[PDB]
Amino acid sequence: TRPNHTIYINNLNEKIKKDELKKSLHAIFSRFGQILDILVKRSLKMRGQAFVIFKEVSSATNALRSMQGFPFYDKPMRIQYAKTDSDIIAKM
RNA sequence: GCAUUGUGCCUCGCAUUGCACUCCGCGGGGCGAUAAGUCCUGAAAAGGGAUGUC
Ligand SMILES: Nc1nc2c(ncn2[C@@H]2O[C@H](COP(=O)(O)OP(=O)(O)OP(=O)(O)O)[C@@H](O)[C@H]2O)c(=O)[nH]1
Ligand SMILES: Nc1ncnc2c1ncn2[C@@H]1O[C@H](CSCC[C@H](N)C(=O)O)[C@@H](O)[C@H]1O
Ligand SMILES: [Cs+]
């Protein structure tokens, strides 16, 4: 899948509260650069998954490559590139 | 306080590995509380449920 501004993460611990799951993800991936938003819902379609929207695709790539399979909340993170640009990016 | 309702949150059981920004699994239970909010007020960046009826 082609490099993107947004990394799509899944195999996440569905039992983590939404507000808390976001600030973790943020605090964690801010290592690899600046973050424009994190999209997270705990709906049936969107639980266990998250969208981290980087400012620069370089950041996302280093994030994808470094944090792949990382032990996060007793599960190994599965990180791909998003299949499409996030809305906040296309409006630019 | 009772009716209807928008919008999101938390928990438990079963279920779910799911590509979103067009956003609600089923079922118990608990929620105006800026927590959140996809809903509302305001053109000013912030703020907040609403109509009804004692
Ligand atoms: N019967 C009746 N009781 C009310 C009403 N509003 C508040 N109460 C009383 O208020 C208690 C609940 O508190 P709240 O509803 O939070 O009061 P509030 O938010 O200031 O209510 P409002 O003044 O109507 O905006 C209840 O036990 C009621 O007895 C009302 O409109 N009718
Ligand atoms: N945003 C909010 N903050 C706090 N409590 C809320 C709330 N939205 C709804 N409630 C609670 O839910 C009650 C309405 S019942 C509505 C539940 C929900 N819309 C559903 O369809 O499943 C309110 O009287 C209060 O008990
Ligand atoms: Cs529920």
Side-chain angles (χ1 to χ4, degrees), chain A residues 1 3-40 42-44 46-90 92:
Chain A
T1 180
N4 197 336
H5 276 101
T6 317
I7 54 170
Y8 168 89
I9 317 167
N10 66 313
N11 202 71
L12 296 188
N13 193 340
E14 300 189 359
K15 271 142 182 199
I16 308 318
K17 283 174 200 164
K18 157 188 171 179
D19 205 17
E20 172 184 6
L21 170 77
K22 259 184 67 163
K23 302 181 197 286
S24 318
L25 278 175
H26 184 277
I28 282 296
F29 286 93
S30 304
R31 266 286 150 82
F32 313 93
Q34 185 179 341
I35 311 186
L36 317 170
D37 223 346
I38 292 184
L39 261 77
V40 159
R42 302 181 75 186
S43 50
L44 175 74
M46 298 301 280
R47 64 190 56 173
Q49 320 150 68
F51 283 83
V52 184
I53 287 141
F54 280 107
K55 179 150 154 185
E56 304 288 320
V57 180
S58 64
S59 284
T61 292
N62 192 29
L64 201 156
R65 209 185 27 85
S66 294
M67 292 303 270
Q68 177 65 39
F70 178 83
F72 192 59
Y73 281 96
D74 304 299
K75 305 176 73 59
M77 279 191 266
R78 181 183 317 167
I79 318 188
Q80 313 107 281
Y81 292 107
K83 289 194 295 203
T84 52
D85 281 7
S86 311
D87 281 344
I88 177 183
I89 285 138
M92 257 173 32

